[PDB]
Amino acid sequence: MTNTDLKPLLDNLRNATEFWNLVAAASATDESTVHNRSYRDALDWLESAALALGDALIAQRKA
Amino acid sequence: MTNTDLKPLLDNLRNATEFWNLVAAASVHNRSYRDALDWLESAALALGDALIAQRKA
């Protein structure tokens, strides 16, 4: 909940989202095998970065 | 970004995370599992895109 503590978790989520957005743009021309791999990778990073920030928000509320 | 703009987006991600964790703790199987995954992805993307949208000037 501190601006200091949240910064690396917010940057990680922002970058995962920028990667996801790039994957979405590339999916207009990617072959399907390339898309499925990139999309699975982007979803994994989106989820892990979201959950890391969410678990820190949960832990801070419990205080 | 501003602490008042963040709060709703952070609240939604926190709730989606607590929901996700509890679905996982009880074990692509359930109506609740699908809704929690949907809500996690949507809260992650909403906050991610707001961070991108703000960081322009």
Short mmCIF file of N, CA and C in Angstrom, two decimals:
data_model
loop_
_atom_site.label_atom_id
_atom_site.label_comp_id
_atom_site.label_asym_id
_atom_site.label_seq_id
_atom_site.Cartn_x
_atom_site.Cartn_y
_atom_site.Cartn_z
N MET A 1 0.82 -1.21 0.00
CA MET A 1 0.00 0.00 0.00
C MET A 1 0.86 1.27 0.00
N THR A 2 2.12 1.13 0.43
CA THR A 2 3.09 2.21 0.26
C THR A 2 3.39 2.42 -1.22
N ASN A 3 3.53 3.69 -1.62
CA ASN A 3 3.95 3.99 -2.99
C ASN A 3 5.28 3.33 -3.32
N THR A 4 6.16 3.19 -2.33
CA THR A 4 7.43 2.49 -2.55
C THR A 4 7.20 1.00 -2.78
N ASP A 5 6.41 0.36 -1.91
CA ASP A 5 6.21 -1.08 -2.03
C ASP A 5 5.43 -1.44 -3.29
N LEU A 6 4.48 -0.60 -3.68
CA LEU A 6 3.62 -0.92 -4.82
C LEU A 6 4.32 -0.73 -6.15
N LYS A 7 5.30 0.18 -6.22
CA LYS A 7 5.94 0.58 -7.47
C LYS A 7 6.42 -0.63 -8.28
N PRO A 8 7.28 -1.51 -7.73
CA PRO A 8 7.76 -2.63 -8.56
C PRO A 8 6.64 -3.57 -8.99
N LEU A 9 5.59 -3.71 -8.16
CA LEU A 9 4.47 -4.56 -8.54
C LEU A 9 3.60 -3.89 -9.60
N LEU A 10 3.46 -2.56 -9.54
CA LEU A 10 2.71 -1.87 -10.57
C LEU A 10 3.46 -1.86 -11.90
N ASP A 11 4.78 -1.57 -11.88
CA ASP A 11 5.59 -1.61 -13.10
C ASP A 11 5.53 -2.98 -13.74
N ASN A 12 5.65 -4.04 -12.93
CA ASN A 12 5.55 -5.40 -13.48
C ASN A 12 4.21 -5.62 -14.16
N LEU A 13 3.12 -5.16 -13.55
CA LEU A 13 1.83 -5.35 -14.20
C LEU A 13 1.72 -4.52 -15.47
N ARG A 14 2.19 -3.27 -15.42
CA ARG A 14 2.18 -2.43 -16.61
C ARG A 14 2.93 -3.08 -17.76
N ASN A 15 4.12 -3.62 -17.48
CA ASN A 15 4.93 -4.20 -18.55
C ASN A 15 4.29 -5.48 -19.09
N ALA A 16 3.78 -6.33 -18.20
CA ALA A 16 3.02 -7.49 -18.64
C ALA A 16 1.83 -7.07 -19.51
N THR A 17 1.19 -5.95 -19.19
CA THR A 17 0.08 -5.50 -20.01
C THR A 17 0.56 -4.98 -21.35
N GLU A 18 1.65 -4.21 -21.35
CA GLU A 18 2.22 -3.77 -22.63
C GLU A 18 2.65 -4.96 -23.49
N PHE A 19 3.14 -6.04 -22.87
CA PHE A 19 3.50 -7.23 -23.64
C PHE A 19 2.26 -7.89 -24.22
N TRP A 20 1.24 -8.06 -23.37
CA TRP A 20 -0.05 -8.58 -23.80
C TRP A 20 -0.63 -7.77 -24.95
N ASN A 21 -0.55 -6.43 -24.86
CA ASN A 21 -1.08 -5.58 -25.92
C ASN A 21 -0.30 -5.74 -27.22
N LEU A 22 1.02 -5.94 -27.11
CA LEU A 22 1.85 -6.21 -28.28
C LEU A 22 1.52 -7.56 -28.91
N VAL A 23 1.38 -8.59 -28.08
CA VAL A 23 0.93 -9.89 -28.55
C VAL A 23 -0.39 -9.76 -29.31
N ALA A 24 -1.33 -8.96 -28.79
CA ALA A 24 -2.61 -8.77 -29.47
C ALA A 24 -2.43 -8.10 -30.82
N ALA A 25 -1.56 -7.08 -30.91
CA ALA A 25 -1.28 -6.46 -32.20
C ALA A 25 -0.61 -7.44 -33.15
N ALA A 26 0.32 -8.24 -32.65
CA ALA A 26 1.01 -9.18 -33.54
C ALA A 26 0.09 -10.30 -34.00
N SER A 27 -1.02 -10.52 -33.29
CA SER A 27 -1.88 -11.65 -33.63
C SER A 27 -2.66 -11.43 -34.92
N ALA A 28 -2.66 -10.21 -35.47
CA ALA A 28 -3.28 -10.01 -36.77
C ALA A 28 -2.46 -10.64 -37.89
N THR A 29 -1.16 -10.87 -37.67
CA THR A 29 -0.29 -11.43 -38.70
C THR A 29 0.50 -12.66 -38.27
N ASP A 30 0.60 -12.95 -36.97
CA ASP A 30 1.27 -14.17 -36.51
C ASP A 30 0.60 -15.42 -37.06
N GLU A 31 1.42 -16.40 -37.44
CA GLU A 31 0.89 -17.75 -37.65
C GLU A 31 0.32 -18.28 -36.33
N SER A 32 -0.63 -19.21 -36.44
CA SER A 32 -1.39 -19.64 -35.26
C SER A 32 -0.52 -20.31 -34.20
N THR A 33 0.52 -21.05 -34.61
CA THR A 33 1.37 -21.68 -33.60
C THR A 33 2.13 -20.62 -32.81
N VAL A 34 2.64 -19.60 -33.51
CA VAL A 34 3.35 -18.51 -32.83
C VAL A 34 2.41 -17.76 -31.91
N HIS A 35 1.20 -17.48 -32.38
CA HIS A 35 0.25 -16.76 -31.53
C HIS A 35 -0.07 -17.54 -30.27
N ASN A 36 -0.36 -18.84 -30.39
CA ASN A 36 -0.79 -19.59 -29.22
C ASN A 36 0.30 -19.60 -28.16
N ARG A 37 1.56 -19.68 -28.58
CA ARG A 37 2.67 -19.68 -27.63
C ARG A 37 2.83 -18.32 -26.98
N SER A 38 2.84 -17.26 -27.78
CA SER A 38 2.97 -15.91 -27.22
C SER A 38 1.80 -15.57 -26.30
N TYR A 39 0.59 -15.94 -26.71
CA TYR A 39 -0.59 -15.63 -25.90
C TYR A 39 -0.55 -16.37 -24.57
N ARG A 40 -0.19 -17.65 -24.58
CA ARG A 40 -0.04 -18.39 -23.33
C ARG A 40 1.02 -17.76 -22.44
N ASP A 41 2.12 -17.31 -23.04
CA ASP A 41 3.16 -16.63 -22.27
C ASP A 41 2.66 -15.31 -21.71
N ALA A 42 1.94 -14.53 -22.51
CA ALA A 42 1.42 -13.25 -22.04
C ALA A 42 0.39 -13.44 -20.93
N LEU A 43 -0.48 -14.44 -21.07
CA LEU A 43 -1.46 -14.70 -20.03
C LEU A 43 -0.77 -15.11 -18.73
N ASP A 44 0.27 -15.94 -18.83
CA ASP A 44 0.96 -16.36 -17.62
C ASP A 44 1.56 -15.17 -16.89
N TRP A 45 2.22 -14.28 -17.64
CA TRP A 45 2.83 -13.10 -17.02
C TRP A 45 1.76 -12.15 -16.48
N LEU A 46 0.68 -11.93 -17.24
CA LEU A 46 -0.43 -11.12 -16.75
C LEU A 46 -0.95 -11.66 -15.41
N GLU A 47 -1.22 -12.96 -15.36
CA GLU A 47 -1.76 -13.56 -14.14
C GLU A 47 -0.77 -13.47 -12.99
N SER A 48 0.49 -13.86 -13.22
CA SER A 48 1.43 -13.89 -12.10
C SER A 48 1.69 -12.48 -11.58
N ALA A 49 1.75 -11.49 -12.47
CA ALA A 49 1.93 -10.12 -12.02
C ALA A 49 0.68 -9.58 -11.33
N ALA A 50 -0.50 -9.94 -11.83
CA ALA A 50 -1.73 -9.51 -11.17
C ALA A 50 -1.82 -10.12 -9.77
N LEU A 51 -1.55 -11.42 -9.66
CA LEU A 51 -1.69 -12.10 -8.38
C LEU A 51 -0.66 -11.60 -7.38
N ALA A 52 0.55 -11.25 -7.84
CA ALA A 52 1.57 -10.76 -6.93
C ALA A 52 1.16 -9.42 -6.32
N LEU A 53 0.58 -8.53 -7.13
CA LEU A 53 0.07 -7.27 -6.59
C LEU A 53 -1.17 -7.50 -5.73
N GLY A 54 -2.04 -8.41 -6.16
CA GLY A 54 -3.22 -8.71 -5.36
C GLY A 54 -2.88 -9.35 -4.04
N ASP A 55 -1.87 -10.23 -4.02
CA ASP A 55 -1.51 -10.84 -2.75
C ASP A 55 -0.84 -9.83 -1.82
N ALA A 56 -0.12 -8.85 -2.37
CA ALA A 56 0.42 -7.79 -1.52
C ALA A 56 -0.68 -6.87 -0.99
N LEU A 57 -1.71 -6.60 -1.78
CA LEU A 57 -2.82 -5.79 -1.29
C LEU A 57 -3.57 -6.51 -0.18
N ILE A 58 -3.78 -7.82 -0.35
CA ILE A 58 -4.42 -8.63 0.68
C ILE A 58 -3.59 -8.63 1.96
N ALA A 59 -2.27 -8.82 1.83
CA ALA A 59 -1.41 -8.89 3.00
C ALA A 59 -1.37 -7.56 3.73
N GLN A 60 -1.38 -6.45 2.99
CA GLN A 60 -1.32 -5.14 3.63
C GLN A 60 -2.62 -4.81 4.34
N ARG A 61 -3.76 -5.16 3.73
CA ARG A 61 -5.03 -4.96 4.43
C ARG A 61 -5.05 -5.72 5.75
N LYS A 62 -4.48 -6.92 5.76
CA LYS A 62 -4.32 -7.68 7.00
C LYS A 62 -3.14 -7.08 7.79
N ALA A 63 -3.40 -5.90 8.36
CA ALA A 63 -2.40 -5.17 9.15
C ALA A 63 -3.03 -3.95 9.82
N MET B 1 0.46 7.38 -11.08
CA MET B 1 -0.95 7.73 -11.16
C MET B 1 -1.53 8.06 -9.77
N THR B 2 -2.70 8.71 -9.73
CA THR B 2 -3.23 9.25 -8.48
C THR B 2 -3.82 8.15 -7.60
N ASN B 3 -3.70 8.36 -6.28
CA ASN B 3 -4.16 7.37 -5.31
C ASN B 3 -5.68 7.20 -5.31
N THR B 4 -6.42 8.20 -5.77
CA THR B 4 -7.87 8.05 -5.86
C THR B 4 -8.28 7.34 -7.15
N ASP B 5 -7.54 7.54 -8.25
CA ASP B 5 -7.80 6.78 -9.47
C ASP B 5 -7.43 5.32 -9.30
N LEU B 6 -6.36 5.05 -8.54
CA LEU B 6 -5.90 3.67 -8.39
C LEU B 6 -6.87 2.85 -7.55
N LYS B 7 -7.37 3.43 -6.46
CA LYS B 7 -8.12 2.69 -5.44
C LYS B 7 -9.19 1.77 -6.00
N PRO B 8 -10.13 2.20 -6.85
CA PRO B 8 -11.09 1.24 -7.41
C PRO B 8 -10.42 0.11 -8.18
N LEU B 9 -9.42 0.43 -9.00
CA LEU B 9 -8.74 -0.61 -9.76
C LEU B 9 -7.98 -1.56 -8.85
N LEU B 10 -7.31 -1.03 -7.83
CA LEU B 10 -6.64 -1.90 -6.86
C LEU B 10 -7.65 -2.74 -6.09
N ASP B 11 -8.77 -2.14 -5.67
CA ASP B 11 -9.80 -2.90 -4.96
C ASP B 11 -10.30 -4.06 -5.80
N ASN B 12 -10.58 -3.81 -7.08
CA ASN B 12 -11.06 -4.87 -7.96
C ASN B 12 -10.04 -5.99 -8.11
N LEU B 13 -8.75 -5.63 -8.20
CA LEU B 13 -7.74 -6.67 -8.36
C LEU B 13 -7.58 -7.46 -7.07
N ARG B 14 -7.62 -6.77 -5.93
CA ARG B 14 -7.55 -7.46 -4.64
C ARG B 14 -8.70 -8.46 -4.48
N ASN B 15 -9.95 -8.03 -4.77
CA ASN B 15 -11.09 -8.94 -4.69
C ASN B 15 -10.94 -10.11 -5.66
N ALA B 16 -10.49 -9.83 -6.89
CA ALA B 16 -10.30 -10.90 -7.87
C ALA B 16 -9.23 -11.88 -7.42
N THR B 17 -8.20 -11.37 -6.76
CA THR B 17 -7.13 -12.23 -6.25
C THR B 17 -7.62 -13.08 -5.09
N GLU B 18 -8.37 -12.49 -4.15
CA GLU B 18 -8.90 -13.27 -3.04
C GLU B 18 -9.84 -14.35 -3.55
N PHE B 19 -10.65 -14.03 -4.56
CA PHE B 19 -11.57 -14.98 -5.18
C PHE B 19 -10.79 -16.11 -5.85
N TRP B 20 -9.80 -15.75 -6.66
CA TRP B 20 -8.92 -16.73 -7.31
C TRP B 20 -8.28 -17.66 -6.29
N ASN B 21 -7.68 -17.10 -5.24
CA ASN B 21 -7.01 -17.92 -4.22
C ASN B 21 -7.97 -18.91 -3.57
N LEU B 22 -9.21 -18.49 -3.32
CA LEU B 22 -10.14 -19.39 -2.65
C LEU B 22 -10.62 -20.49 -3.59
N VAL B 23 -10.86 -20.17 -4.86
CA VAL B 23 -11.18 -21.22 -5.82
C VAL B 23 -10.03 -22.24 -5.88
N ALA B 24 -8.79 -21.75 -5.95
CA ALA B 24 -7.66 -22.67 -5.99
C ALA B 24 -7.55 -23.46 -4.70
N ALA B 25 -7.88 -22.84 -3.56
CA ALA B 25 -7.72 -23.51 -2.27
C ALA B 25 -8.72 -24.64 -2.07
N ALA B 26 -9.86 -24.61 -2.76
CA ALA B 26 -10.84 -25.68 -2.60
C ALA B 26 -10.48 -26.94 -3.37
N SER B 27 -9.50 -26.88 -4.26
CA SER B 27 -9.10 -28.06 -5.02
C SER B 27 -7.90 -28.75 -4.37
N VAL B 28 -10.06 -25.52 -14.39
CA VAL B 28 -11.10 -25.38 -15.41
C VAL B 28 -12.23 -26.36 -15.09
N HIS B 29 -12.87 -26.16 -13.94
CA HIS B 29 -13.84 -27.12 -13.42
C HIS B 29 -15.19 -26.52 -13.03
N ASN B 30 -15.28 -25.22 -12.77
CA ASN B 30 -16.45 -24.67 -12.10
C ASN B 30 -16.92 -23.40 -12.79
N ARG B 31 -18.19 -23.07 -12.57
CA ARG B 31 -18.70 -21.75 -12.90
C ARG B 31 -17.98 -20.67 -12.09
N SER B 32 -17.64 -20.97 -10.83
CA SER B 32 -16.91 -19.99 -10.02
C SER B 32 -15.46 -19.88 -10.47
N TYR B 33 -14.85 -21.00 -10.86
CA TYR B 33 -13.49 -20.94 -11.38
C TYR B 33 -13.42 -20.08 -12.63
N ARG B 34 -14.35 -20.28 -13.56
CA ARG B 34 -14.34 -19.49 -14.79
C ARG B 34 -14.59 -18.02 -14.49
N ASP B 35 -15.51 -17.72 -13.57
CA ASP B 35 -15.78 -16.32 -13.23
C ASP B 35 -14.59 -15.68 -12.54
N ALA B 36 -13.91 -16.42 -11.67
CA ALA B 36 -12.76 -15.85 -10.99
C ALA B 36 -11.61 -15.58 -11.96
N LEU B 37 -11.37 -16.51 -12.89
CA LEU B 37 -10.36 -16.29 -13.93
C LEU B 37 -10.71 -15.08 -14.79
N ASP B 38 -11.96 -15.01 -15.26
CA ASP B 38 -12.44 -13.85 -16.01
C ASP B 38 -12.22 -12.56 -15.23
N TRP B 39 -12.56 -12.56 -13.94
CA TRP B 39 -12.48 -11.34 -13.14
C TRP B 39 -11.03 -10.98 -12.84
N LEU B 40 -10.18 -11.98 -12.63
CA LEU B 40 -8.75 -11.71 -12.50
C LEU B 40 -8.19 -11.07 -13.77
N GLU B 41 -8.46 -11.67 -14.93
CA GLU B 41 -7.94 -11.12 -16.17
C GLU B 41 -8.46 -9.71 -16.40
N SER B 42 -9.74 -9.48 -16.14
CA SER B 42 -10.33 -8.18 -16.43
C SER B 42 -9.81 -7.11 -15.46
N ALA B 43 -9.61 -7.44 -14.18
CA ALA B 43 -9.06 -6.47 -13.24
C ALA B 43 -7.58 -6.20 -13.53
N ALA B 44 -6.83 -7.23 -13.93
CA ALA B 44 -5.43 -7.05 -14.29
C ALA B 44 -5.31 -6.12 -15.49
N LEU B 45 -6.09 -6.38 -16.54
CA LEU B 45 -6.03 -5.59 -17.75
C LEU B 45 -6.51 -4.16 -17.52
N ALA B 46 -7.56 -3.99 -16.71
CA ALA B 46 -8.06 -2.65 -16.46
C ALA B 46 -7.01 -1.80 -15.75
N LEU B 47 -6.32 -2.37 -14.76
CA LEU B 47 -5.32 -1.58 -14.06
C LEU B 47 -4.07 -1.43 -14.91
N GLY B 48 -3.69 -2.48 -15.64
CA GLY B 48 -2.55 -2.37 -16.53
C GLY B 48 -2.75 -1.30 -17.58
N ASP B 49 -3.95 -1.26 -18.18
CA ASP B 49 -4.20 -0.29 -19.24
C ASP B 49 -4.32 1.13 -18.70
N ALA B 50 -4.84 1.28 -17.48
CA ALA B 50 -4.89 2.60 -16.86
C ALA B 50 -3.49 3.12 -16.57
N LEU B 51 -2.60 2.25 -16.08
CA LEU B 51 -1.21 2.65 -15.89
C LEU B 51 -0.57 3.11 -17.20
N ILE B 52 -0.82 2.39 -18.30
CA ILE B 52 -0.31 2.80 -19.61
C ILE B 52 -0.95 4.13 -20.03
N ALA B 53 -2.27 4.24 -19.87
CA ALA B 53 -3.00 5.42 -20.33
C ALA B 53 -2.52 6.68 -19.61
N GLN B 54 -2.30 6.58 -18.30
CA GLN B 54 -1.85 7.75 -17.56
C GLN B 54 -0.43 8.14 -17.97
N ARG B 55 0.46 7.17 -18.10
CA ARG B 55 1.86 7.48 -18.37
C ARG B 55 2.01 7.92 -19.82
N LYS B 56 1.67 9.18 -20.06
CA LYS B 56 1.82 9.82 -21.36
C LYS B 56 2.35 11.23 -21.15
N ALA B 57 1.87 11.89 -20.11
CA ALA B 57 2.33 13.23 -19.75
C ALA B 57 2.15 13.42 -18.24
#
